[PDB]
Amino acid sequence: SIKELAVDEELAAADGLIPRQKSKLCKHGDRGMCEYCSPLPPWDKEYHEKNKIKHISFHSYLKKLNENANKKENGSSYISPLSEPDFRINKRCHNGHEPWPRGICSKCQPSAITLQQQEFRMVDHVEFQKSEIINEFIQAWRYTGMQRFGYMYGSYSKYDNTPLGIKAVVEAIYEPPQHDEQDGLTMDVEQVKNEMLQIDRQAQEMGLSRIGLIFTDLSDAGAGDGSVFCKRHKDSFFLSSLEVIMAARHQTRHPNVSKYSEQGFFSSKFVTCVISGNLEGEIDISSYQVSTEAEALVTADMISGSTFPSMAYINDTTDERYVPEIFYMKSNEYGITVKENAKPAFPVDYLLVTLTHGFPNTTNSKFVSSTGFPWSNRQAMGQSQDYQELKKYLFNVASSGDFNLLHEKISNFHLLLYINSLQILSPDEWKLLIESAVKNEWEESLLKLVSSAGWQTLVMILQESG
Amino acid sequence: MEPAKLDLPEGQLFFGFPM
Ligand SMILES: [Zn+2]
Ligand SMILES: [Zn+2]
């Protein structure tokens, strides 16, 4: 199926109006309304500037496009309000010529590209269900001094602190196999793709989607504080050009389904978080996405990292790639822009959108526990998933009859993945285990689980190990 | 001035830029 997400259907059905006060300057009577005091549309620029909201939401943006479209004279052919930008040359155009690089015409030749700060964002906010999730991720760095990469799992729902907002709600982090170092890390892309395909399938059975990525850039400041260097700030960079390219690739691989787009998709709800030092030398999180222009640049293979982290390098025209003139709308301190040449390299922050982040207050968290059983791919930290560990974690509790404690133990993302990897439980029993871990009313499921053949078999296997 | 191309393969992350 290819339907829209529930949150999108819900926000399309909201109107997002913002009532205003009548003004001293209104020219009508003591009662009534006019265009100067009437409710604001959800995309209202001045409202967002006034409340320090850096981008309008996706659904505010879509409603803005729809209103402009409805100004066409009626009868005119319908046009989808959204379209994913595409900067790729058509290497199969035979319109009175042989295809690139042996010919070119107005139908196949990319015209000049103008980059500017994107006015909307697909996701507005990243909410981590528990601080323990982030803190255990950070522990990989704390223990090793090496950086860490993870994929975030969860869902999307409404965010009320901006007009028609959306938040990504993070329930867990999965760290793929990786070689970590003090100043970076390397993944085998094929290995990771293959592994995450399997995790995606299992996470979906738990009601989870892969909703973003997260990484550390943490360096001890050398003061014994536990304090770290601030590397990312207004006078340096926020995301490097390498990281923007990474985010763009992920966004394009995780398209956002939209019935209002020519292509049936538009951009992505996939979010990018970085954990690094803030101006006070504290460990903190920053959340981003990249623009649709960034998606299109990277799909067209037009940009590369550069030796200056704040800058993207623009690639050359080849037999496989066509790079037109590229400009960007360079902003001054008042936000006023002037068109400038983006070649040979340009500031990548024009390709960024910023998101807010936070935690909920004291709780529909999917997993009761976030820690206590080793996360995946942590053998180098001395945390391996094996029978010895599972027995230590689970065995005595599983035979105590304490379902509160058993529930706390099995309601654990990495625990569930490990147990399913053992292929002891049947699909039916695996489903019971998931229900026991994530349902509000879990006790009935757990009672069925514990009485099942597969579970009794698992418990016996544990008993007879060690 | 201007930077050089630093075209790292997909899946390689680097943070060791001079502060
Ligand atoms: Zn009025
Ligand atoms: Zn052509």
Author numbering:
A (entry chain A): 112 to 473, 477 to 580
B (entry chain C): 287 to 305
Sentences from the paper on this structure:
Polyubiquitylated proteins in isolation can be direct targets of the proteasome, whereas those embedded into membranes or assembled into multisubunit complexes need to be extracted or segregated by the conserved AAA-family ATPase Cdc48 (yeast) or p97/VCP (metazoan) with the aid of its cofactor complex, Ufd1–Npl4 (UN), prior to the proteasomal degradation. The UN heterodimer is one of the best-characterized cofactors. Here, we present the crystal structures of yeast Npl4 (zf-Npl4-MPN-CTD) in complex with Lys48-linked diubiquitin (K48-Ub2) and with Ufd1 at 2.55 and 1.58 Å resolutions, respectively. The crystal structures reveal that the distal and proximal Ub (Ubdist and Ubprox, respectively) moieties of K48-Ub2 interact with the C-terminal helix and N-terminal loop (N loop) of Npl4 CTD, respectively, and that Ufd1 binds to the groove of Npl4 corresponding to the catalytic groove of JAMM.
To further reveal the structural basis of the interaction between Npl4 and Ufd1, we determined the crystal structure of yNpl4113–580 (E123A K124A E125A) in complex with yUfd1288–305. In the crystal, yNpl4113–580 formed a stoichiometric complex with yUfd1288–305. No large conformational difference was observed between yNpl4113–580 alone and the yUfd1288–305-bound yNpl4113–580. In the complex, residues 298–300 of yUfd1 NBM form a β-sheet with Ins-1 of yNpl4. Leu296, Phe326, Leu353, Met357, Phe419, Pro420, and Tyr424 of yNpl4 form a hydrophobic groove to accommodate Pro289, Leu292, Leu294, Gly297, Leu299, Phe301, Phe303, and Met305 of yUfd1. Gly is more favorable than non-Gly/Pro residues at residue 297. yUfd1 NBM is kinked at Gly297, thereby fitting into the hydrophobic groove in the MPN subdomain of yNpl4. Although the sequence of Ufd1 NBM is variable among eukaryotes, this GxΦxF motif (x and Φ represent any amino acids and hydrophobic amino acids, respectively) is well conserved, reflecting its functional importance. Leu296 and Phe326 of yNpl4 interact with Leu299 and Phe301 of yUfd1, which occupy the third and fifth positions of the GxΦxF motif, and Tyr424 of yNpl4 hydrophobically interacts with the main-chain CO group of Ala290 and the Cα atom of Lys291 in yUfd1. In addition to the hydrophobic interactions, Arg364 and Thr418 of yNpl4 form hydrogen bonds with Glu296 and the main-chain NH group of Ala290 in yUfd1, respectively. However, the present yNpl4113–580–yUfd1288–305 structure reveals that the groove of the MPN domain accommodates yUfd1 NBM.
